[model samples]
Target: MRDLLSKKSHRQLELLELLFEHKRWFHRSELAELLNCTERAVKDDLSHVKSAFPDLIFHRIINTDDSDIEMVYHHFFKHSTHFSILEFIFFNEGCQAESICKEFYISSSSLYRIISQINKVIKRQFQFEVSLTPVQIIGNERDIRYFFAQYFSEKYYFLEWPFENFSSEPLSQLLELVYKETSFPMNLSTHRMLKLLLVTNLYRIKFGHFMEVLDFLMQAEGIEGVAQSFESEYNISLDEEVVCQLFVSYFQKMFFIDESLFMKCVKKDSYVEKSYHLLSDFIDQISVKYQIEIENKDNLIWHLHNTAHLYRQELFTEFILFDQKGNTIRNFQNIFPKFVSDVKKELSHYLETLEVCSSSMMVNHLSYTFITHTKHLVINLLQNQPKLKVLVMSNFDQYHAKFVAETLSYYCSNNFELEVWTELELSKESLEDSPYDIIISNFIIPPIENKRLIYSNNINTVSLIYLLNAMMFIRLD
Candidate 1:
């Protein structure tokens, strides 16, 4: 999947998105105008797209109204399920082997081979082992959900159940009710995860599989009302325990568990104390090794608490941190070589005393948290540093100018303090009184003494990189 998509140019991606959304015939001129490029560029993009998808079919039609013009080609690539065999097994819990073979047009031996391949993938990717006699996915509920999440994400081109059957109407209605009734403000991703969880549980409940109760309802606030609302709307009776488990499971995946909820759940256990000591020791070791201060104890404790909750549920080891794009590890190594080296060395020394199957997974998890926190701190410091005065001259509308300013601010906040002005506002007197270190414009401006000038028609990754290089050279000079 990464190989198929990673090489796509930004313009090519935009073209594909447009085609996918419209799913109709488009004139070459119309496409060129929409993409803000020439017709030749549009043809090149189409050629590249065709090269990527050799199986894609485009139909050519004639234009009746304009006999002089040629109207060639319309195409739509519809999404379909990649794992029909596994989907069948999941949707239909138990059935005859002969019937299963006939449905998917396979012989007995072929069916067995497919099942074997499925088991191999499950074991390798998800760390689960199971048989096909009864067509059951054998794993803890959280592990199973995580596996399904990754599967769905990978096969996103092929929309399958529970996603296919997951309706927006139900989710929107429930979300509206929750927002009006509770203090929890759910974001788009949270809402989607919640919907997916509900759909998974709905299907599992139909197959007589249920959630095991790990936390009590009293420990979490506002969950009982949510459970009641869900049951009433969905026409399913979820036991109090299952509801509590669902709340915690979804909350743990989406964000760190609230401190109050964590305290409630661990009141009688030593998990919190152990996790605190472990984190403190880990931070102290890293700080000493790198000769750096580790001042974010609260942030470290929050993640440790979340990890401890997963450990209590027997899920920490089962969770696999998959590098889907295949570049995350490489990027981390490139961006923070020293930090990665010190983390691996220190964590290796620390995990030697603990009994675990593999420390690689744990190391990756800890490094992810630490790197994320440290990266933000560095970016924040850079953004707060003193900035250079910059002037932007554009003929575009106020909205476009504002958008360009905001976007540049994100990447150049540490380097430049920007002011936007219309091209008509530029004058000799203005230039003399308020000289800018740099001036950027869409059109050529009169030469000013001792000031850098740059011209760009649009803001994009390539243009931004060039601008950053120019800023760097200016600063050095």
Candidate 2:
């Protein structure tokens, strides 16, 4: 009341005084006379009062000679504004519309009027409506945080927990949709975790026929093969198996769909990008079939690193780019050793099996070793070769050059033809004196360097100058 009085203007104070003095009713002419102003001026002052203190009530009662205008205090004045509601919900406990109206000696209608306006503003500005749910005080810090996080984060889409009771069918449907939608390879560990969770949750439900139907559909679309392969890989003996758990976890957790989708759109010809739309379209069809709320349908998917390898087959076949950080090497260490061992055995068997066929085995080596692990891994890869010949160990410093020569002398005792070129001093003669079956350099030595090294008729000089063009253009047309 004091704050309101201090903030009120002269006209506003006059209007308040008129209302306070005449508790029941006062004719506009009588009030104007009491205030020494015209009725028109009184009306103008009331308008300013309404603007200043919108909580007040000043109205006309028809057929009232005693007083044409009536002034009454609104009991729920404290609960009729945005600031009041905001304070009530967040700051004041036990502050419902009814409670606040009772405490403030205001009418329930006035309290509700303010609350309704608050709701309207919240809905229009935030795209979220407010309501009292059975759940505890709805707009807590956690609720606010979740609201903003979901609203701002691309992956934060609406998801209603569909399986309030026990049912795996919806889960199955979601899994199928995710697997189809996912473009990247799935992670095996996360896939296994999801599978375990699903089986444990829906223990009683029989989903054999349901899963079979899903498999049949997936197979028809060329995706069932991969799904079946997963089952075979796991060797699960259960009959009514659900694979959705693993499928959903991968897309939802590993690769966030929202970020993935954005990356796809910007990066032209992303394999996943092209598949994203196709998967989403199919999901829409599934949603229609299940009668699931399109808004509530889960949108995120998670895949683990191990499963991701399946999508890229070359992960098993191609020579991986090794580096100092062991980024590529560490991940595939176990899998790579197994793969290399198998390939080596197969190569040995094939060579032995076809002994009658005229074939030769050769090994090539290069300098520029960066780490001990690099040397160790390379040595382990080539140690079992019995018929190795024509070793090409290129440009080396004196220490490495001498080390390689000693190693070759000790290992290749059969006088296997070895090519070793050392240029430690970077001398013109060092470059010119070398004439062999092949000449490779650490730096991109110009034509002059090549001229000094050019002597042998059956020689080839490999330089990085033509390498990029050769590689790119060879694949061009």
Candidate 3:
């Protein structure tokens, strides 16, 4: 999904992301080269963000006309009052036009214009878009809650609680009620997520909105108890449908658990159970395709079901905390090669059998869960595979050559077959005669013709992880 902003605002956000990478001052030359723009262009971007998202740039960036700028506080949005125009309008309780204008110091006319901008841009990323007058995202009530559920999941350097007129004490107690009714795990982590979700539903209900999702009911055993507790404590009424929204949101986000433990939590014939068995079948497919006898198979199945929850319509939308779903898929495909698409291929078939449409976003999470959990199996799959044959031949001395060899031997694990050779043992004939797959040396090779052991320098940020994967697959190419 695209960021909900224009080109200049995108540049401003991009510059903020770059500036947050370091604490030291950045000179025009430095920012210019890093941003790949002219020095003046870099300055203009800094100034533009400062003017527009002033609250974003406020104390975090040093303001000066000099040739350099420094990041004063590494924590960008930790305590910031800078709400996105999109968040500001939707998160407001009453959607009070004049009061919102007073908050942003913009005229009612400009506020309408900003709301128009959000409507156009948000359509690019989310399924629903907001309205100025109604002060709510226009969508099915169930989906609106999912949008906020995911909004809480989306984050940056740090995000403040976006809701008001709520406190952690009451929300914390509500989570207990949820835990008492459902056997879902409760912790400081789940506490915060549930709070954000609770506030969203409470306000949506307060504003006279209700979900029309009939399938999601108080089907989960303890859902009614949690619903009743919320009504009595907060003095707001919750019907069966609104209670079900609470259940669906809570179910998908926190339902990840061990196989045996879940037998205690959910009914044996529920959709949750059906989703489990389907994913179990899916994992069987992954294991068969790779010829890997996975050790912890049932546990892997449960994690896959966590992602499958979305496709199963257990939740209204996909849920993921980090916004790197794009990078996650690409990274796997790059590092693991055809393994990703092949796994996703089997996943597509499994999802089809269940008759659920697979979004690439959910599939990305599915791919990550399967690929990550299968690494134990991946390592063992390569267990009988050959070691990376290495010859550490440095030009300096026996100590230098031995140092590099030992480094490769110790850190590179048993995957690398290590040997040492120096200038004393080096020769035109010696370079060409070795049977090693690769040679690591501190000195530059003179482009000698040696195919037995290809040459390389001692590695880096070079990530020694490449040494094994290159050996197993990429072949150092």
Best by TM-score: 3
| Tens digit of per-residue lDDT, candidate 1, span 1-477 | 111122225466567545643546888988889978888888988998667655445562222233211011111111111155665665566667777788877788878876776666556545544346776666666556555554443333223334543454554564555555554547865556555555655556655565564334334555556556556665556465444544546445423446555445444546555555666687777656555545766566566445434432322233322232223444666655766777655555544433322256555655555655553444432333346677766676666656666777677645777778745566766775675777777777777786777777766646864675467535433
Winning candidate number (lDDT): 3
In candidate 3, position 60 carries an lDDT of 38
RMSD (Cα, Å) of model 3? 8.5
Query: What shift in Å separates residue 173 of candidate 2 from its native position after superposition?
Result: 18
**Better candidate by TM-score, 1 or 2:** 1
Ranking by lDDT: 3, 1, 2
- Runs of candidate 3 with Cα error greater than 4 angstroms are 1-4, 10-83, 120-138, 155-159, 185-192, 213-245, 250-282, 311-322, 375-385, 392-408, 420-427, 437-477
Give, for candidate 1, the lowest lDDT window spanning 10 residues: 69-78
In candidate 3, what are the lDDT values of residues 183-224, reduced to their tens digit?
A: 566776556656666677776776767655424334555546
What does each candidate score in C-alpha RMSD? 12.3, 30.4, 8.5
Candidate 2 local lDDT, 1-477, one digit each (tens): 112211224344455544643356778887778767777877877776566555555563222234212121221223234444443443233335566666556686765665556556544323333342311123332223222222111111122222223333444444455556655336653333333345332321222212111244343453454444434543333222444422333333223444545444435745444333433443354334433334422232111111221221111111111121232333343434543333333333332332311111110000010112132443344334342222233344545434544554455434233445534355556555654322333344435443312222233333322321232211112
TM-scores for the candidates: 0.53, 0.18, 0.63
Give the winner by lDDT: 1 or 3: 3
**What's the lDDT for candidate 1?**
0.54
**Which candidate, 1 or 3, has the higher TM-score?**
3
Q: What are the lDDT scores of the predictions, listed in order?
A: 0.54, 0.36, 0.58
